[model samples]
Target chain A: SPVVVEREREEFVGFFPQIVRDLTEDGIGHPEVGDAVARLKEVLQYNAPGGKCNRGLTVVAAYRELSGPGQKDAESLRCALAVGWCIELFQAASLVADDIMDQSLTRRGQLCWYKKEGVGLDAINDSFLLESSVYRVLKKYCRQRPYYVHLLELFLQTAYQTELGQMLDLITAPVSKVDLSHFSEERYKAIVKYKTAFYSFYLPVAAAMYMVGIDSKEEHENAKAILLEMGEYFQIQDDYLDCFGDPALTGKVGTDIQDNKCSWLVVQCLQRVTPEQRQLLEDNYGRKEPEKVAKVKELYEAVGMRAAFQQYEESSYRRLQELIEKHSNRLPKEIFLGLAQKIYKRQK
Target chain B: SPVVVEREREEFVGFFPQIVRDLTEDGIGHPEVGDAVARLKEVLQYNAPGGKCNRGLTVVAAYRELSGPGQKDAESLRCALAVGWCIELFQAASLVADDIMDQSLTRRGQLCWYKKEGVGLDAINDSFLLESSVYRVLKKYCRQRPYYVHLLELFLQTAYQTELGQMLDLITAPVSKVDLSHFSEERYKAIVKYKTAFYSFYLPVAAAMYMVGIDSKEEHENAKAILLEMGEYFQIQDDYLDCFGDPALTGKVGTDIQDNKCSWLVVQCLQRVTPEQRQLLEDNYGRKEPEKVAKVKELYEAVGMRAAFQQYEESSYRRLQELIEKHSNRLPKEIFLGLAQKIYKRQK
Candidate 1:
């Protein structure tokens, strides 16, 4: 199974250089942009490939599941890989910019792109460059396709939604200002739905749907209904894992508490707190010290947050099931069903 | 003449409310992105207007020139104004992010948007929000036109080129490091050509050209040839103006030397410096001390940088004149000539 996974990764990762060559040599071959080609390669190399590729891999997976096996020719495979990397590249751009906004020190088990020695604030331009490259890749590969304009609009729409989501998240919890009144079930759900779900879930699946010629408004409406809800559920799992899941299993320590992120736990904890308990959170939330982080965690435990979360998880899973059954009306139900099983009650 | 200027500006600026209404009320009217609509208005409000609008006006001017007076109907005028604002919005997005990267404090004679009370690194997301709005505005206004895809590609292409130029500029003269070897005549020219010229000069005219059905590769090549060179000469004027021009006229003090920018003066000075003079630059070039700035200026005078710039401008004017004659093929030559005259020696 591990070998099979490695092979899949190899197939995904193997197409990167061709993408790089297209950017460096084919798209802009001029000497005036000389060193930038070298730098763009470095930009793509450092930021594009290191992630687990769950979002990117989803593009290809959805592509395969939508387009029947007979159409899986070399040309089709090439377009799928390119589109997958566009998703990867979009995440790279967002994460590079986000790490700076969040003041994150490390990502993907390394110093964040902005944290690297020479990057500093120039990572902003790099983010722009990364975003611009998505269109470049799309133009080269998908231009002749009938749904090219739809693809461009879809990506732009998702980008706008994600940025709006990020705006909500940033306003919800400024790390330096720990006002618990701002944290609510409504804002937390909005943040997850806008910021994480739209791009991470709906985008890859929508991209696949477009490629397979499923471009009707009702079809998209139904698809977004399913994907965005599943996305919120996935982000809730992440919030839970950040607080309570094993670090070794999750592959990194969580910083949502220390970084003053508006996690699902915090929303639940805020809803149930006494004025006396609220004072403790006020003094401790968003602090850098371990003792404060532990106190916040301890407060979550004291308030039966885990039990509340367990019930919510069961309810959310049920809600997602209802959404899938209702919205996967015209589409193949098996693909959405497969996604549901993959994310439900996951540890990592 | 001033009333005429205001009338032209009114036609362009008066349409902004319609633009704002589209963004806040129509494109993303969802209640969930509630506060963000308020913030988006603030983004466009703060960053969109209040400039000389040489670039925005250029779009309308070129559009008028390319399509004769008979077609200035309500619908056509609406598209021109919207497209002009797209250029303005692109600049708004770029400048907001650039202000953050350049650490520039004042913009449009107000505190830079990022420097405003509630907007810090959060401006990064705001910048993305601004850019995404450009595409949104484009989609709303230009979707039914034949050149919609062409418009998107051109904007994306120009955005990419501008970012690449910014990248070259950043790498050439990082503020904390000032090695004169990096300030070559070649690099300075490249920075001006890519960073400033493409977006400022080529984009507006090219958008007009595409709108008027002049969408051949050769026409673009010919048009870009004239505009990019014109753009370079315009930037050279900026570089000179930054150092020598009066702030009362220019409305901003030059920080090229203080900020360690790789300006034309530095390139000229670097080409002609004695070994003893090199040490003088090494000491005082990037320093903020008044005496050090004076020393750098004195060195520029000593090295005859001003005279060299005058001669270069004269020669550049001639070169641009020749390019206009050679490359304005089948297109109206007067627009390029008018642009040339306006920017040949602009004070601000």
Candidate 2:
């Protein structure tokens, strides 16, 4: 909604082709790989863009907040934007693989990258292509900076956290199996934090911190405390949106039930379901039939999930505020405040 | 073939669990991911260890040759072995994905890890997990080394080269198509150089060079020139073996023909075919039927491919000697000499 965000997106999107060229047509290019280079150009074009880019934007915004007054210059902002795009590149890589793992059909209202014509399992390597660009871009742009190694280490560390979360999530909710016994609050938090929160929330801010010369352990630990919690709330809100929000607004079909995802609603339902209700729940939760999915929704409504979510949302907002107040460590209250405001009442 | 290779491999294999434990049970582990961690451990064991261990062993061998006497002490050997395993880890990751892409069945005489029970498309993420460990291990063992950033850059650079090669190979031999029009010697060389040569040869020697403080651009260019040339020779030898080597000795069935690979054999055949032979090859080249493959083999014999390959082997060996002799650049000649000698006129 901010004008600066839309403006930054222009610079960010405009700079992406340079990354593609760096991989495809620059020094790495050969006359023989014209076709593969063309395909790579298309893969980066089709997959790297088209997201909301909120995670990427957070890097620039956080860097601005963390740096001293007038410390940001054109050269520094370029580095900030490139680092932001690196975050998005990581997201792009994960999403391409995650979509295949989830067997998802459309992402961002189009067929998944893997589902594109002539881009089948080949998209797996294409995802790695995107990921390898993360370091390539970091080295080309940030190699002179003192924080270069830190950025490399951070991206890789964040990648594994996200992958570990993915492993945990896939194990918790096998796409074909309906095992409600695996859903627990503790497990749900870990999966979301490891998978979603680290990449989305922590990585962007951590990159900014590293960029701005904030290299203290206690400071990072404090920031992790707040961002990880805030990330969990963002995901629960996503779970609520998947089932409860209007499809027109969210712009995609909800498949958590069909995919047997370890969603927040499912975990809360596990806590509240009576034995008979649980039996019905276990029977209906993971099946893909509309009626079966509808039955799970029926139980979810019977369990008053909407009202419970409302209460949970308010409780989450309160807790997030306390964590922000206690753990922002005097960086800037508006940083966490802005992030929380975007999520607490988000419609998409 | 040698006693020392067997010995180096024993220590290399013994050190693998430490890498796995570094990823799983140590700092990155969580109580909620017991099942996920167990699966990761199993993935590492099943996929990472079954290779010939040559690419990895080269790290130690090249390190010893490049480092001064007593510079190869126990402490530094640990780092050499760790980086060596990093190469193997990259190989394991690429193999897991390549098997799925090729729809390949048996690898190292067992079912592909992706084909194993309960591990379907999820192996995509598992390959990535293996890859992420490359950086993880590097950071843990080599972070304090002067060449840490260089190693990271080399691995990422090598990964893209391999992916680009894979991309070209896929485009050239689109598993379902029979298009000899796309085959050529230049494209074939580029494919082998990018896909097979970089990781297999240059990465190991280059990493060892970096470990021993060989940082000049000229020195690296010298190593890359010799190793990449030698690696292409290695892959052509692989193509030669695929059609002519025994299945029992090679340890698996050959699919390069059925897979429509841009192999050295096909490139050489394209040059030597008459119009009718070319049409027969186009018809029989990519088919899965044994008769079709046998027909292609028949044409290969009629065209004197065995005699041609023998000539090519001698030509390759003599060319490698000139390259190594001229470009070893004050490093021990035995380094490239060892790698070149290993590949020339060899049986599996």
Candidate 3:
């Protein structure tokens, strides 16, 4: 299992270099815009390839577990590759746009893609290029597959869902101006599921299922329920790590408070707080000063969100386990367990 | 012939309302972004549908002229409708992006798509909606046509060519801060041909030829050569009108000098001016001040650009007629004559 995990990690490492090359070679083929195009190509490499690539790797691992013995080796590999690259491309597209949206200076321990020298809103077009290339790659490798339409539909629906989530996030957690009164637990959960979970968890597994002849509508719905819950837990853990994890191990300092992020901690603090305490959060939630961020952290301590998160994480995992049990008759239990183990504990 | 012309014009007018409804209904369907999307949909209608529509209308007109007595009337009519809609969609896409790129406030007697409330850079996505709809319409109407591949290739190539020209135009004729050094006559003509003439002139006619079964590549090339030359002259006259024609009769005040437009007049002025005059233009062009723009206009008059434009327009029209004479075989002289007459003395 460790070797299989390592292999998935190595596959992600191997894929980005070539994807960067294809983006560069194909995007800047126009000689007139060569310089701007080259800058964009470099930004794509810097942004897309740097993150923990669990979402992308799940595509390949899921495909291997789902493909029947009679399935063609080439077909399975092609589907995995397509889904893997789609994740990379999807992330690249969002990161390019996010850097502009967040106005952040760093990502993955380096200058954010939009903040790199001489790249500005032109990165908007670069983001569009990243998205358009997904279609080019799909047409090239997946066009002849029987599941091509399914894959395309899944990709488009996921993209639209993610965009909606992004819009909601922008509307809800605007930078340095959070009014915690506007926060709703249901809305926060909706944002997290749509924005993070569906694409991150269900998308890869669904893509794999479609690839190896298991793409019945009912089968997909069954798989999605288990995977999406795990995805929500994964995101909650990410929010927990933002404030509590070792900065060195996480490889970056946290900005969630200063950035006015819509994290589970803040949501929970709002739920548990007195009226006066809630007003204090409204004033300090998104301020840039360390003191302001510290005051908000004090509120989290007062609310005991750390203990609440411990309880929630356990419940989330139990729910995921239950869903997996209910649906394991339709899909191999190993597929769910394999993905769960990969995601359950992480320092980075 | 006049009756036929009126009937054709009526047919063109009828097709557009449905396409416009499709754009509005499909594009603004989501409830969350409905307000922004609806604003963009109206922008598409107001800007895209107001043109003289020769390019879009010609698709239908040429299809009728070319389809023989024995051809299936329904099939050719559908091709004409699809191709005409494609031209409209292409124009809408370019104008949506161009309005943002040019930073213009008004287009076609209304606020630019980007300038409309709640529809800023999100107009980029709306422009994409406009483009993606072209393919949807093509799929709906032309998927089974013999020349579906040809139609797809034409639109794809035209989009790339126009975007490249737009890239060059953005570099050379930036709206906010003008650089006269970037304005050259050769570059202006190149931009005009690539950005406007190919799609506006050759594309519509070629689609008609394809539908009518004159699918010869050589014939399309010949038609392109003649139509592009005519398009060049038409654009030059438009540039001339931007500066020299009467605002009252032309129905709009000119802003080319203040806008730093890469017009034929400016390029000609640059070509004809002495070094000091060129420097003066470099300093004054694109300035918002009335006096600075007036000084540039005075300098343009001193350099005799008005007379130069008159001479260019006359010679360009003569060349177009000569090209038409050489190329117009049995392809119906009426097709050439009809479009040419519309361009010869146009005001808006």
- Please report the candidate that would top lDDT against the real structure: 1
How would you encode candidate 1's per-residue C-alpha lDDT over B1-348 as one tens digit per residue? 367646777899888888888888753556677887778888888898888777888888888888867768889878988998899999999999889998987887899999987789999999998998899989989999999999999998889988998998888877555688777787788888888889999999999999988999999999999888888877777787777666565546655577777787777887688888888977798778899998888888888776777777878888887888889778999789878767886443
**What fraction of native interface contacts does model 3 preserve?**
0.00
Comparing 2 with 3 on lDDT, the higher-scoring candidate is 2
Per-model lDDT: 0.84, 0.83, 0.73
For all the predictions, what are the DockQ values?
A: 0.81, 0.70, 0.19
The 10-residue segment of model 2 chain A with minimum total lDDT is: A247-256
TM-score of 2: 0.95
Model 1 DockQ class: high
Lowest summed lDDT over 10 consecutive residues: which window, candidate 3 chain A?
A: A29-38
| Sliding window of 10 residues with minimal summed lDDT for model 3 chain B | B31-40
Backbone N/Cα/C clashes per model: 0, 0, 0
Show model 1 residue runs off by greater than 4 Å.
A1-9, A26-30, A251-256, A346-348, B1-6, B26-29, B245-248, B251-256, B346-348
| Residue B311 Cα positional deviation in candidate 1, in Å, after optimal superposition | 2.2
Per-prediction CA RMSD (Å): 2.4, 2.4, 5.1
The CA lDDT at B240 in model 3 is: 67
Candidate 3: what lDDT? Answer: 0.73
Model 2 C-alpha lDDT per residue in residues B170-278, reported as the tens digit of each score? 7787745568887878888988888888999889989998888888889989988888878888888878788876656453445557767778787788879899899
Alpha-carbon lDDT of model 2: 0.83
- lDDT of candidate 3 over A60-145, digit per residue (tens): 88878877777648656755866688887887777777776677887777777767654455555566556665655665577678
